[PDB]
Amino acid sequence: TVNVGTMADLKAKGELKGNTPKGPVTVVPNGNSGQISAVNPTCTHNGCQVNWKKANGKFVCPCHGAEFAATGKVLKGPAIRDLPTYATQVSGNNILVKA
Amino acid sequence: TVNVGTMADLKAKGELKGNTPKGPVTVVPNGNSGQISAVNPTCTHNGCQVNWKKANGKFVCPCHGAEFAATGKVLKGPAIRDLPTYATQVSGNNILVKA
Ligand code: FES
Ligand code: FES
Ligand code: NI
Ligand code: NI
Numbered sequence: 001t002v003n004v005g006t007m008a009d010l011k012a013k014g015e016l017k018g019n020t021p022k023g024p025v026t027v028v029p030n031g032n033s034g035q036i037s038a039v040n041p042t043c044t045h046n047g048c049q050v051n052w053k054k055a056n057g058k059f060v061c062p063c064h065g066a067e068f069a070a071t072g073k074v075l076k077g078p079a080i081r082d083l084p085t086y087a088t089q090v091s092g093n094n095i096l097v098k099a
Numbered sequence: 100t101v102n103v104g105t106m107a108d109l110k111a112k113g114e115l116k117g118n119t120p121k122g123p124v125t126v127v128p129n130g131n132s133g134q135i136s137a138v139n140p141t142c143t144h145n146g147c148q149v150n151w152k153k154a155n156g157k158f159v160c161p162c163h164g165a166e167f168a169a170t171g172k173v174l175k176g177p178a179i180r181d182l183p184t185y186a187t188q189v190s191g192n193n194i195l196v197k198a
Binding site: 063064065077078 | 162163164176177
C-alpha cells in the first residue's frame with residue numbers, strides 16, 4: 001500500500017497524488033461522509049494525465065477534453081472507458097492506496 | 100487540375116470529394132455568391148478525415164470533435180492548425196481543384 005496523506009490533507013488540498021506499483025494515483029473525495037475515490041489519472045483515450053476540477057466535480061483531460069466523475073466513470077468522450085481505480089483503506093486518518 | 104464535379108453537383112450533394120497529388124480534397128460552399136472552398140479533410144490534430152456537416156456549416160472531426168469552418172479555419176480544438184486548402188477554379192460549371 002501507498003500512504004498518500006491524511007484525510008485532513010485531502011480536505012485542505014482537495015486531492016492527493018501518489019505513485020503506486022500499478023501507476024499514478026489521484027485520490028479525491030467521493031462524497032461528504034468520508035468517502036474517497038482513488039483513480040489512475042491516466043486518461044483512457046490517449047494517456048494524458050487528467051486533472052481534478054473540484055468546482056465541476058469532475059476530472060477533465062487537458063489533451064482532448066474527456067471528463068470523468070470522481071469515481072473514474074467516463075462522462076464525456078473521446079475516452080470510452082472508465083479510469084482504472086484503486087481500493088483504499090483509511091487507517092487512522094491515513095489514506096492508504098492498495099495494489 | 101482535378102475535376103471533382105459541377106456547381107450543380109455541389110449544390111445537390113452539399114460537397115464534392117476527390118483525390119489530388121497532395122492528398123484528399125473535400126469541396127464545400129463558402130457563401131451564396133458561388134464561393135467555394137477546397138480543403139484537405141485530414142484533421143490537423145491526429146489525421147482523421149473530418150466530415151462536412153452542411154446544417155452547421157462546419158467540418159467536424161469524428162475522432163475528437165475538432166471543428167473547422169468551410170475555409171478550413173480551426174473553430175474548436177483539439178486541433179490548433181487550420182486545414183490545408185487548395186486553390187480552386189470553376190471552369191464552365193466544372194470545379195477544378197489545383198494541387
Ligand atoms: S488523452 Fe484524454 S481525451 Fe485524449
Ligand atoms: S483527429 Fe481530429 S480532433 Fe483528433
Ligand atoms: Ni492529441
Ligand atoms: Ni483518439
